[PDB]
Design a protein around this ligand. Sequence first.
Ligand SMILES: Cc1ccc(CNC(=O)Nc2cc(S(N)(=O)=O)ccc2O)cc1
Ligand SMILES: [Zn+2]
Length: 257
Amino acid sequence: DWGYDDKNGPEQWSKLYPIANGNNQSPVDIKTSETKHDTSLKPISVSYNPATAKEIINVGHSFHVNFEDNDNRSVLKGGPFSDSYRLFQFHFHWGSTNEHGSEHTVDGVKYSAELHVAHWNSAKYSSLAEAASKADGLAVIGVLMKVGEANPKLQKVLDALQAIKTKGKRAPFTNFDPSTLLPSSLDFWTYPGSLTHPPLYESVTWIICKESISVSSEQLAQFRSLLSNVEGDNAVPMQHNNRPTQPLKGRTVRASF
Ligand SMILES: Cc1ccc(CNC(=O)Nc2cc(S(N)(=O)=O)ccc2O)cc1
Ligand SMILES: [Zn+2]
C-alpha cells in the first residue's frame, strides 16, 4: 500500500488515490504577497480538557496522540468557523534532516517539522468517520516547527515514545492539553484543503499559525528514531513523513492579520 519511500511515496499516491491530483490538495506554499487579509475572520479559540487525552500509537509512518471525542470537552471555535470542532488527535511530520520536514512552507521556506492538531465538525456530523469525507468536516491547526532551542512543552510526548518504538505499539497517554504546544500568538492563515496523506480527502479547513514553535536537533532525532517495522523485524527508522507542497489551483489563502 502507501508510504513515504520511492515506490509507495507521495509521487505514487495518485495511482490508488486520484484525488492526489485534485484542486484542493494540501500542503501548499503560502506566498505572503498573494494572501488576502480577511476582516471577517474571528480569533481562534481553543478550549481543551486534559482529561480527553487517551492514547499514543505507532502507526508505522508516524505516531498519533488520540483524544476521547464523545462530547465537547475539547473544542476549537472562531477563526473562519461558525461550527464548533471537536479535538480528536495531534501528530507531527518531519524530514530526513533539519533542512526540511514541515509540510506547509511559507514563501518557499521549509521548516524542520510541523505539528497538526486535528478536529471534526460535531455541530454538523455525528462521528469522525462521517465528517472525514465532507468538505466542511475537518479542521486542522498546523504549526511550523523551527529548529533551535529544545522545546520543553514536547517533553511528555517525547518521553512516551520509548513505549511505542515499533509499528502497532500503543500506550495510554493521559492528562495532557495540546494547546500548551501552540505558539503564544494565534495569528493565522486559512485555506480549503485536504488530508496530507491517503486517503487525501478534500475535507480540511487549514489553520496555519504565523508564529513558529521551537524544536531542537535532538528532539527531531527522537522522532526519526521511531521504527516503522514491527517488533522483531529489521529496524527501519521513520526518517520522514512530509508531503511536497501542492498547486493552489486558484484557491485563496486568507490571513487573519
Ligand atoms: C477511513 C478514514 C480516513 C481518514 C479519516 C480522517 N483523517 C484522520 O483521522 N487522520 C488523517 C490526518 C491527516 S493530516 N496530516 O492531513 O492531518 C492525513 C490523513 C489522515 O488519515 C477518517 C477515516
Ligand atoms: Zn498531518
